[PDB]
Amino acid sequence: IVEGWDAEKGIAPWQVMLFRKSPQELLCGASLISDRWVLTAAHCILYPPWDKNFTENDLLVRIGKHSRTRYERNVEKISMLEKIYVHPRYNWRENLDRDIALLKLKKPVPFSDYIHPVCLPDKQTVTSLLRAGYKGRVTGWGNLRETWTNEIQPSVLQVVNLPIVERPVCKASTRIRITDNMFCAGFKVNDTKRGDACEGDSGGPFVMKSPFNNRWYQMGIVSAGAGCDRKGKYGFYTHVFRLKRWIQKVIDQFG
Amino acid sequence: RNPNDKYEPFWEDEE
Amino acid sequence: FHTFFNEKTFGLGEADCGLRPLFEKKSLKDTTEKELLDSY
Numbered sequence: 256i257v258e259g260w261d262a263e264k265g266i267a268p269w270q271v272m273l274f275r276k277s278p279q280e281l282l283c284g285a286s287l288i289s290d291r292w293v294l295t296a297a298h299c300i301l302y303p304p305w306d307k308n309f310t311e312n313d314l315l316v317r318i319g320k321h322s323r324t325r326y327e328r329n330v331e332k333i334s335m336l337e338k339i340y341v342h343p344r345y346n347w348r349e350n351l352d353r354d355i356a357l358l359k360l361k362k363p364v365p366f367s368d369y370i371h372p373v374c375l376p377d378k379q380t381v382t383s384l385l386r387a388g389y390k391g392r393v394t395g396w397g398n399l400r401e402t403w404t405n406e407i408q409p410s411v412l413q414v415v416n417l418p419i420v421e422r423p424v425c426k427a428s429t430r431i432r433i434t435d436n437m438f439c440a441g442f443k444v445n446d447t448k449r450g451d452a453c454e455g456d457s458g459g460p461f462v463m464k465s466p467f468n469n470r471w472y473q474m475g476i477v478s479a480g481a482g483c484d485r486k487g488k489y490g491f492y493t494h495v496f497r498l499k500r501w502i503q504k505v506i507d508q509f510g
Numbered sequence: 511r512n513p514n515d516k517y518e519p520f521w522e523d524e525e
Numbered sequence: 526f527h528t529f530f531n532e533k534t535f536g537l538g539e540a541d542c543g544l545r546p547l548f549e550k551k552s553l554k555d556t557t558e559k560e561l562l563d564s565y
């Protein structure tokens with residue numbers, strides 16, 4: 256995350272770390288939606304151009320974490336993955352349309368002060384909170400700044416608040432063909448505040464707290480942060496609700 | 511060991 | 526809150542989804558949710 260700050264313990268109990276079994280390596284962020292299911296980005300699992308095609312066996316998730324590298328005994332939980340489901344329409348060749356994937360946990364994970372699920376959104380939640388200007392929150396252990404110039408890897412989880420941005424404005428900020436399945440967020444050029452998600456924050460959650468019920472909802476999945484080395488105007492996120500149906504089709508049907 | 515492990519080992523307290 | 530999934534295919538959690546143990550449940554606030562609220 257660029258231009259964010261140290262997360263408070265338990266500020267985002269649904270934050271998950273997608274971890275490569277060997278070489279042990281942090282791959283992406285992810286979110287806990289129930290004690291058996293985790294959401295992350297499809298490109299965090301599959302990307303043919305770089306030889307990436309992970310199976311449930313090569314990966315692992317770490318839950319309830321704060322420190323990026325320490326073993327948080329008695330606090331974090333490690334879980335194996337039973338299966339990985341990448342949206343069958345995931346577009347990696349061109350624009351990441353449908354950049355989402357579902358991971359079923361080998362066993363249910365216990366909730367605690369540090370492990371608690373985030374709500375998915377419904378029609379009402381979308382149309383009332385997903386609007387230009389409204390700020391959402393992104394969390395991650397991605398890099399602190401572009402590479403090659405301090406220290407770039409955080410030692411603890413990071414948070415940053417970002418404002419959604421008008422679609423037409425998102426579309427005109429890139430040659431990439433944007434779709435209804437995604438949305439962008441971030442401050443403007445002349446804007447005083449920067450703050451963005453970087454590459455290692457991919458797959459993580461974009462969440463908004465309802466003013467109604469006080470419940471947090473995950474509106475998007477970091478699909479293409481615009482920070483650090485990537486630099487583009489705004490960051491792009493997979494539109495969770497827009498994919499809510501595929502999420503049931505997968506769940507109701509496989510676990 | 512240790513500086514050879516970018517991440518502290520995390521299997522204790524397991525299964 | 527009002528569910529949407531079947532507990533036996535989705536596991537536990539939905540019903541109480543979205544409420545943080547160390548913040549909401551304790552009537553406590555994190556250092557910056559005001560910023561988010563203010564923008565709504």
Ligand SMILES: *[C@@H]1O[C@H](CO)[C@@H](O)[C@H](O)[C@H]1NC(C)=O
Pocket residue numbers: 303308
């Ligand atoms: C890797 O994914 C490719 C491209 O999506 C698919 O054809 C293949 O079945 C996957 N790897 C194997 C052999 O399991």
